[PDB]
Design a protein around this ligand. Structure first.
Ligand SMILES: C=CC(C)(C)OC[C@H]1O[C@H](O[C@@H]2C3=C([C@H](C)CNC(C)=O)C[C@H](O)[C@]3(C)/C=C3/[C@@H](COC)CC[C@H]3[C@@H](C)[C@H]2O)[C@H](O)[C@@H](O)[C@@H]1O
Ligand SMILES: C=CC(C)(C)OC[C@H]1O[C@H](O[C@@H]2C3=C([C@H](C)CNC(C)=O)C[C@H](O)[C@]3(C)/C=C3/[C@@H](COC)CC[C@H]3[C@@H](C)[C@H]2O)[C@H](O)[C@@H](O)[C@@H]1O
Ligand SMILES: [Cl-]
Ligand SMILES: [Cl-]
Ligand code: NA
Ligand code: NA
Ligand code: NA
Ligand code: NA
Lengths: 5, 224, 224, 5
């Protein structure tokens, strides 16, 4: 799953 | 509200306790109470606020995705009913955060303005994840875009807040705005310009910046 | 209650959905609603009920332990206040479960009676973990003891419910009743008698029984 | 930490 912060 | 009778310092203290206990709903309620005291948040206090609601909605989003997947697999009303229930709760938390930002926090130092504008884009983006929508997407884009303009003018390329904003705005482009090329370009330009600015990576921001740079490379590897 | 208008079958269905979504508070509310319909729970439905509240209180207990440790380290009132807040919430959930058991479920087949009596001991034990107490400990002991008598008479040594009851009753002896030798004896006798009864380990109970046997050996290794 | 089930 793509990353966010 | 329920926190009106508690000292601001005590709310901050209990937010840190709740964080250690992984009680993120309590943590968010305490930080909301602190925001309601009317004073601006310090750098550390902004982090407490963001972490609390990020974890609250993070669990709701993960649950929503499980239920939505089950719902799509089925192509009774129970699955839809429960998914809508989790969805309504998720939207309520997003509305609570957006209300705090617009009523109290967004007004100042570029670091705080960009921080809150990123949050505004993030929680409109979470609303967009479940929306079935154009207004919501436009509101997320505006917030992200204003934050991008400020951070480009006021902050170095390696600043973790600027980096995190770009990471999330890139994700917005990819899976919300259906613009994979824009997402890829933004992630690459951000990573490259931060790589050429490591000479100014300041001791107490090195770990945050390099972590986010790796998240940028994670997404580029996934998308290319 | 809030679940009074929903079909029993729909409550069971949404409890399974909530389990897949790791929404254990919802899961517990749905199963409480199902119990409130007045009909006895099937084997699978009892598992849903126990898993839901086990995870709810599990998170509260873990948070309570973090806060209590911080409180003891400090030897302001905030730490005590927040620990008492989590403690009160934990006690409320225990009271809710104990109320369901005593008002609806405990009355029948030995498998269900032992199941519910183990739960009664477990949730009095959780009350004892935070009590500062003799009445509570005595109530936990009675429930466990009655469950032990039934399971010894009615169930084989490898039955997972009988095994799990003994594991928890042993933990009760060790850290609640301050009887390490009784805890050790019970765990060893239970493990040994189950090892000599593997010839009757029934396909759909093998994984549960061997798992709990390893938990029994885990505790013996820790305590000896 | 000791085990329960
Ligand atoms: C108040 C105390 C606690 C323990 C809660 O502080 C958490 C962490 O807050 C700082 O960091 C921040 C940060 C993260 C870093 C990536 C974590 N770093 C590592 C090595 O994991 C993840 C968080 O969500 C947070 C707050 C969010 C934002 C997002 C916030 O958008 C609104 C943008 C990027 C990033 C910045 C602000 C980081 O500055 C400190 O510098 C770290 O020491 C500290 O762990
Ligand atoms: C209804 C569907 C779901 C997915 C929730 O069912 C959960 C698991 O319910 C069964 O098992 C039970 C059991 C556990 C096993 C140790 C898990 N097994 C493995 C290999 O991890 C841990 C649980 O807390 C539970 C319910 C509790 C009790 C405790 C209950 O005291 C009141 C006593 C021991 C144990 C028994 C009842 C096991 O029969 C099935 O047999 C397993 O397939 C299934 O996973
Ligand atoms: Cl529902
Ligand atoms: Cl409190
Ligand atoms: Na292209
Ligand atoms: Na690739
Ligand atoms: Na001895
Ligand atoms: Na040992």
């Amino acid at each position: 799953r793509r990353k966010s912060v | 509200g329920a926190m009106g009778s508690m000292e601001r310092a005590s709310l901050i203290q209990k937010a840190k306790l709740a964080e250690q206990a992984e009680r993120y709903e309590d943590m968010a309620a305490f930080m909301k109470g602190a925001v309601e005291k009317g004073e601006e948040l310090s750098c550390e206090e902004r982090n407490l606020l963001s972490v609390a609601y990020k974890n609250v909605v993070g669990g709701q989003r993960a649950a929503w995705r499980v239920l939505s997947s089950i719902e799509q697999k089925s192509n009774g009303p129970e699955v839809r009913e429960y998914r809508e229930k989790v969805e309504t709760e998720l939207q309520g938390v997003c509305d609570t955060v957006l209300g705090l930002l617009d009523s109290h926090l967004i007004k100042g130092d570029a670091e705080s303005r960009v921080f809150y504008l990123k949050m505004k884009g993030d929680y409109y983006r979470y609303l967009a994840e479940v929306a079935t929508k154009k207004r919501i997407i436009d509101s997320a884009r505006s917030a992200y875009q204003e934050a991008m303009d400020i951070s480009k003018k006021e902050m170095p390329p390696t600043n973790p807040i600027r980096l995190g904003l770009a990471l999330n705005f890139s994700v917005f482009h990819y899976e919300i705005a259906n613009s994979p090329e824009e997402a890829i370009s933004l992630a690459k330009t951000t990573f490259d310009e931060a790589m050429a600015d490591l000479h100014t990576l300041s001791e107490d921001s090195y770990k945050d910046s390099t972590l986010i740079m790796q998240l940028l490379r994670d997404n580029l590897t996934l998308w290319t």
